[PDB]
Design an enzyme around this catalytic site. Structure first.
Site, PDB file in Angstrom:
ATOM      1  CE1 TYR A 467       4.235   5.042  -8.351  1.00  0.00           C
ATOM      2  CE2 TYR A 467       6.386   4.440  -7.495  1.00  0.00           C
ATOM      3  CZ  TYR A 467       5.016   4.308  -7.485  1.00  0.00           C
ATOM      4  OH  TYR A 467       4.416   3.436  -6.604  1.00  0.00           O
ATOM      5  CB  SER A 548       0.786   2.442  -9.109  1.00  0.00           C
ATOM      6  OG  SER A 548       0.223   1.895  -7.929  1.00  0.00           O
ATOM      7  CG  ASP A 631      -4.708  -5.241 -11.800  1.00  0.00           C
ATOM      8  OD1 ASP A 631      -3.521  -5.625 -11.772  1.00  0.00           O
ATOM      9  OD2 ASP A 631      -5.157  -4.472 -12.677  1.00  0.00           O
ATOM     10  CG  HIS A 667       0.325  -4.630 -10.475  1.00  0.00           C
ATOM     11  ND1 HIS A 667      -0.542  -3.594 -10.202  1.00  0.00           N
ATOM     12  CD2 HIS A 667       1.551  -4.204 -10.090  1.00  0.00           C
ATOM     13  CE1 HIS A 667       0.128  -2.588  -9.670  1.00  0.00           C
ATOM     14  NE2 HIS A 667       1.401  -2.933  -9.591  1.00  0.00           N
TER      15      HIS A 667
END
Length: 697
Positions: A467, A548, A631, A667
């Site tokens: 991430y 993300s 979202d 989400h």
């Protein structure tokens, strides 16, 4: 060959930004309600299903496998309140966790305490936050519906186990803090107008404030506590002192980890609540770091701070005189967690992406290490006056261990409370390892590799994840889908701690922020290439994935060396840097992303902009983006916008290009088990199909 892709509408519109004209043939992606977007969604998912019908039978097969691997009781940490132990627990397949209240630690029959399960028919409701009273007769929880980040606060009294009529609306980032037995402090956003679906708009967050509401009265008597007129764009939160004499308010600018903190007194007069506004001492008012509060002892005030310490440091600052004195200097490690109880301070250090637990008394701050098996702390419960501490520790191997402890002397009180054991799984079948490899910097970067002991080759399937954003370190953590990958597919998983994360603290993020943001992507390249030179991976048999910002990574690295990868997926990822400042909470992202008004910042932003940087006539790997209609944490449009280019940019070369937009989803925070399980199953079927990793019987 590849089927005919859906006929995308081409928009003539083109906007000029900083003397550069950016064309946009897909502007109608801003509004989800347009007929074009809905028909495009329907056609894209129909073609997705038509593609996937080739191995839908393997889809069902690994759906069965992941379902059988997900069935285990997930018991969290116990909480010692009013001689009763409340802890989260799940049957394994129920949509949400439910609270258990036991009379004792070894109790056999705990009763249910909080049950979100029957709230909504489909179980979309998810518990988001909770808070306790000092008299243990009151608690306030806050949930969310339909996966919308807009929350709702309910309140319950323990003994009767009955609800109350008090409800609140349009609340975000809820921080409940009760004050004695009267009321509680929270935060609230400006009143919404219109008939739009809750959580289904792109308006930026602004003009919010924190206030306090007392029990026994409606919301109409709520008095505004704090609201800043000079800085409308900042976010802020409140916290009540355990000394029951002061209130602390913390203000962040954007999402970047600097805050200014204000300390205020409290009047015992009941009328004073709503009589006059509260004064605010200027304790710290300049952005030098994130000055998180831990506990106070009279005039003294203890904080974990990043000021003059890139790796976090425990400092005592008196607020009645203004002096600051350091009490626990930063070690070479980075503070992951910390708490103060009685005289001891217990600190969990993220040393080499491994949490080591230390305790140090106020006399000698020598951080004495208490043994604990390797793993990663996920949750942590602590109360200043209490004598019981508990934490859950999990990692790739350990599916979860709830472990409790006595503060008085951990020397012989460390005990195992519960284990999240999963049947048909053995620890010895797999093993993990640290690796250090040098990037362009000449400085080693750590990486974790977990693989099944025995058959592992350069051509074996590889999954690589990382991430690296918002100073959140990608610490080890269990995942059912990851275990299905590891044992049922016979592949190897790898986790990268890239530059810019909190894996080494504030200096790491500082180096990996703004002008050097692109640097992080280069590191990711080296990662995969290193796995090819060490003999762990082959370009035709690799897949990398993230979420993300991490999903960002994937697509952006595809722009650098597409042929260095073969399989790629996106998941609610930020992709339209040209307009990311406009919609959703993306404004805070600017503090980590570069403010687009600043020219030097837009230089790099346009340099790495993944929505426009995609080029025709060059091979590209197969991307699979996943999104949900509701979202609001990230605007979903960006993701489809990305696919919007590929549809026209690669006619029949590269890909294939898949967009799975799921109706009525969240989400990633509070996802219902059925939907998240189905999505993970589809993702792993896709990565197996495009890797050709047969059933590892």
């Amino acid at each position: 060959m590849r089927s005919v892709y859906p006929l995308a509408r081409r928009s003539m519109a083109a906007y000029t930004m900083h003397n550069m004209t950016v064309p946009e043939p897909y502007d109608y992606l801003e509004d989800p309600e347009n007929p074009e977007t809905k028909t495009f969604v329907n056609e894209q998912n129909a073609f997705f299903e038509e593609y996937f019908a080739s191995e839908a039978e393997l889809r069902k097969k690994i759906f069965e496998s992941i379902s059988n691997s997900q069935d285990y009781p997930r018991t969290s940490n116990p909480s010692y309140i009013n001689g009763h132990y409340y802890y989260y627990h799940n049957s394994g397949l129920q949509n949400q966790s439910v609270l258990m209240r036991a009379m004792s630690l070894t109790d056999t029959a705990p009763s249910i305490f909080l049950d979100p399960n029957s709230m909504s028919s489909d179980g979309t409701t998810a518990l988001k936050a909770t808070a306790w009273s000092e008299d243990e007769s009151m608690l306030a929880y806050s949930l969310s519906d339909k996966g919308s980040d807009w929350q709702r606060i309910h309140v319950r009294r323990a003994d009767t186990v009955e609800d109350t009529s008090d409800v609140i609306e349009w609340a975000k980032f809820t921080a409940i803090a009760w004050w004695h037995n009267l009321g509680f402090f929270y935060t609230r956003y400006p009143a919404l107008q219109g008939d739009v679906d809750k959580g289904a708009e792109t308006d930026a967050a602004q003009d919010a404030f924190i206030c306090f509401h007392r029990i026994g009265r409606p919301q109409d008597e709520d008095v505004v506590i704090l609201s800043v007129p000079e800085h409308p764009q900042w976010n802020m939160g409140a916290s009540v002192s355990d000394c029951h004499s002061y209130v602390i308010v913390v203000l962040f600018d954007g999402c970047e980890p600097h805050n200014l903190v204000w300390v205020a007194e409290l009047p015992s007069v009941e009328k004073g609540l709503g009589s006059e506004p509260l004064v605010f001492k200027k304790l710290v008012n300049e952005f030098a770091g994130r000055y998180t509060y831990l506990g106070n002892e009279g005039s003294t005030f203890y904080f974990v701070t990043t000021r003059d310490a890139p790796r976090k440091k425990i400092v005592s600052i008196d607020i009645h005189t203004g002096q600051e004195t350091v009490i626990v200097e930063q070690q070479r490690s980075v503070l992951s967690q910390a708490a103060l109880v009685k005289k001891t301070l217990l600190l969990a250090y993220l040393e080499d992406v491994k949490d080591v637990f230390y305790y140090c008394r106020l006399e000698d701050p020598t951080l004495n290490a208490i043994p604990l098996p390797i793993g990663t702390i996920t949750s942590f419960f602590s109360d200043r006056k209490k004598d019981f501490v508990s934490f859950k520790i999990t990692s790739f191997l350990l599916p979860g261990r709830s472990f409790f402890l006595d503060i008085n002397d951990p020397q012989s009180s460390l005990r195992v409370f519960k284990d999240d054991t999963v049947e048909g799984l053995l620890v010895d079948d797999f093993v993990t390892e640290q690796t250090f490899y040098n990037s362009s910097d000449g400085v080693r970067i750590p990486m974790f590799i977990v693989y099944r002991k025995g058959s592992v080759s350069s051509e074996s399937p590889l999954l690589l994840y990382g991430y690296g954003g918002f100073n959140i370190p990608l610490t080890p953590a269990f995942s059912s889908s990851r275990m299905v990958f590891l044992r049922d597919l016979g592949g190897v998983l790898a986790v990268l701690n890239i530059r810019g994360g909190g894996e080494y603290g504030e200096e790491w993020h500082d180096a990996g922020r703004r002008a050097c943001k692109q640097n992080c992507f280069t590191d990711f390249i080296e990662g995969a290439k290193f796995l090819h030179r060490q003999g762990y991976g082959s370009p035709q048999t690799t897949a990398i994935m993230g979420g993300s910002n991490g999903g960002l990574l994937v697509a952006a690295v595809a722009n650098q060396a597409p042929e260095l990868f073969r399989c790629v997926v996106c998941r609610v990822g930020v992709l339209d840097m040209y307009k990311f400042h406009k919609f959703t909470i993306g404004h805070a992202w600017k503090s980590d992303y570069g403010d687009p008004e600043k020219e030097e910042d837009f230089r790099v932003l346009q340099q790495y902009s993944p929505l426009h940087n995609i080029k025709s006539g060059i091979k590209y790997p197969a991307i699979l983006v996943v999104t949900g209609d509701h979202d609001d944490r990230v605007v979903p449009l960006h993701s489809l916008k990305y696919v919007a280019t590929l549809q026209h940019m690669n006619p029949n070369e590269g890909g294939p290009f898949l967009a799975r937009i799921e109706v009525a989803a969240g989400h990633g925070a509070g996802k219902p088990t059925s939907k998240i399980l189905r999505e993970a199953g589809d993702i792993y079927t896709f990565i197996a199909k495009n890797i050709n990793a047969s059933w590892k019987e």
